[PDB]
Amino acid sequence: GSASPTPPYLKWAESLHSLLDDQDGISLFRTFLKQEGCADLLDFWFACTGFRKLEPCDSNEEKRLKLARAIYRKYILDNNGIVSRQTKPATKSFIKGCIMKQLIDPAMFDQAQTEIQATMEENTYPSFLKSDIYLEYTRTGSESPKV
Amino acid sequence: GSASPTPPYLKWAESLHSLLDDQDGISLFRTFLKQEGCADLLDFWFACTGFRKLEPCDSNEEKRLKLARAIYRKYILDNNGIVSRQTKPATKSFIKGCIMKQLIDPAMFDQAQTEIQATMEENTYPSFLKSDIYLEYTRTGSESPKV
Numbered sequence: 515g516s517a518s519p520t521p522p523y524l525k526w527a528e529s530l531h532s533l534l535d536d537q538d539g540i541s542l543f544r545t546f547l548k549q550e551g552c553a554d555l556l557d558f559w560f561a562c563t564g565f566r567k568l569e570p571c572d573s574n575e576e577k578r579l580k581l582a583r584a585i586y587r588k589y590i591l592d593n594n595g596i597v598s599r600q601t602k603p604a605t606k607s608f609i610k611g612c613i614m615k616q617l618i619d620p621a622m623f624d625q626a627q628t629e630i631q632a633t634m635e636e637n638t639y640p641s642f643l644k645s646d647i648y649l650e651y652t653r654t655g656s657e658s659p660k661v
Numbered sequence: 662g663s664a665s666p667t668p669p670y671l672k673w674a675e676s677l678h679s680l681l682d683d684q685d686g687i688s689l690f691r692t693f694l695k696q697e698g699c700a701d702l703l704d705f706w707f708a709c710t711g712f713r714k715l716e717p718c719d720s721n722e723e724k725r726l727k728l729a730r731a732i733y734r735k736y737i738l739d740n741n742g743i744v745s746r747q748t749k750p751a752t753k754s755f756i757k758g759c760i761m762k763q764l765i766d767p768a769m770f771d772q773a774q775t776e777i778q779a780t781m782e783e784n785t786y787p788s789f790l791k792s793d794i795y796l797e798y799t800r801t802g803s804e805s806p807k808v
Contacts, residue, residue, distance in 0.1 A: 522741065538741045541698025560696040564794065577801040584793040656740045659757045 523652050530631070530639045542652060546642045551596065555634050558589045558597045562627035566620050582618050586610070590626065600633045601626045670799050677778070677786045689799060693789045698743065702781050705736045705744045709774035713767050729765050733757070737773065747780045748773045 526533035526543075533539040540556075547553040565585060568578055589597040590606050598606070605625045612622045642648055673680035673690075680686040687703075694700040712732060715725055736744040737753050745753070752772045759769045789795055 537695065537698045537700050537743070538739065539698065540696070541743055542741065544698055557696070561793065564692065564696070568798075573803040573806050575804055577798050577803065580801045581793060581798040584797040588793065652741050656738070659738070659761070661761075 523648065526648075527643050530635055533639070533642075542647060543639075543642050546645055546647060547638060550638070550641075552638050554589055554595055554597050555600070555630055555638060558585070559627060559630050559634070561585050561589070562623040562630075565623055566627075569620055570618070578618055579616060582622065583613055585623065586613050597626075597630060601629050605629060670795065673795075674790050677782055680786070680789075689794060690786075690789050693792055693794060694785060697785070697788075699785050701736055701742055701744050702747070702777055702785060705732070706774060706777050706781070708732050708736070709770040709777075712770055713774075716767055717765070725765055726763060729769065730760055732770065733760050744773075744777060748776050752776060 520528075522536055522538060526536065526539045533543055544553055544556055547556055562585070565578075565581060568574070568581075570578065586609055589595060590601065590609055592598055609622060609626060612618055667675075669683055669685060673683065673686045680690055691700055691703055694703055709732070712725075712728060715721070715728075717725065733756055736742060737748065737756055739745055756769060756773060759765055
């Protein structure tokens with residue numbers, strides 16, 4: 515039989531994974547977050563995904579250290595920021611230890627990433643799925659162009 | 662005298678043209694864009710560059726029409742996408758007209774490409790140049806391998 519693709523907006527409602535696998539979804543969700551001062555949740559989540567992909571070798575040591583320090587300073591250390599409020603003290607302390615000791619394993623941010631993924635799942639993601647930009651603008655179909 | 666090449670990362674900061682002329686730069690910039698749901702800006706820009714290179718002959722008519730329709734459907738018609746939001750109504754209408762009338766000049770996407778190039782120049786490109794992946798990871802030098 516002929517396939518029947520799930521409309522993108524509906525796929526995003528099915529899982530945060532599906533939403534974050536679609537450029538249109540990421541853009542719309544990110545803008546929604548920015549308007550609530552929560553975009554750092556998503557930006558940090560992606561920063562961790564990118565960092566974990568880098569593997570250690572004797573020529574990219576300082577590069578990886580500087581990047582890890584940057585992620586830490588931008589999101590973990592910013593006490594006026596949402597990521598600092600949504601990651602546990604022990605989790606942040608572990609990262610601080612890695613940075614200060616210069617022990618930078620590719621998976622060092624895993625726990626914090628998990629915690630931030632959980633916060634999105636519990637609050638902002640479901641909130642986005644109730645937003646007017648999602649339920650009213652995005653969900654509504656486009657007309658077929660004419661003339 | 663002996664030449665002193667500009668470090669690649671610095672060349673990318675000098676112009677978007679330089680960034681898009683370097684495989685390393687394109688990859689890093691594209692990943693940065695993907696994380697913000699903005700990769701379509703770059704992918705569309707390249708699609709236009711490739712389309713404009715094809716010239717009309719009586720044996721590649723349908724091929725060119727199908728490609729033009731594909732670019733239009735993927736980026737111009739997707740109202741939940743960033744390219745649709747960053748190209749003017751008149752610009753999109755012209756392209757739609759070309760597609761529906763089957764009048765496919767190699768330069769038909771020029772205006773939309775110009776508009777998207779402008780959006781990158783004004784926002785995402787400068788944003789990329791302030792990103793941790795660029796300022797901290799990329800800019801940092803590699804150590805000389807040993808043993």
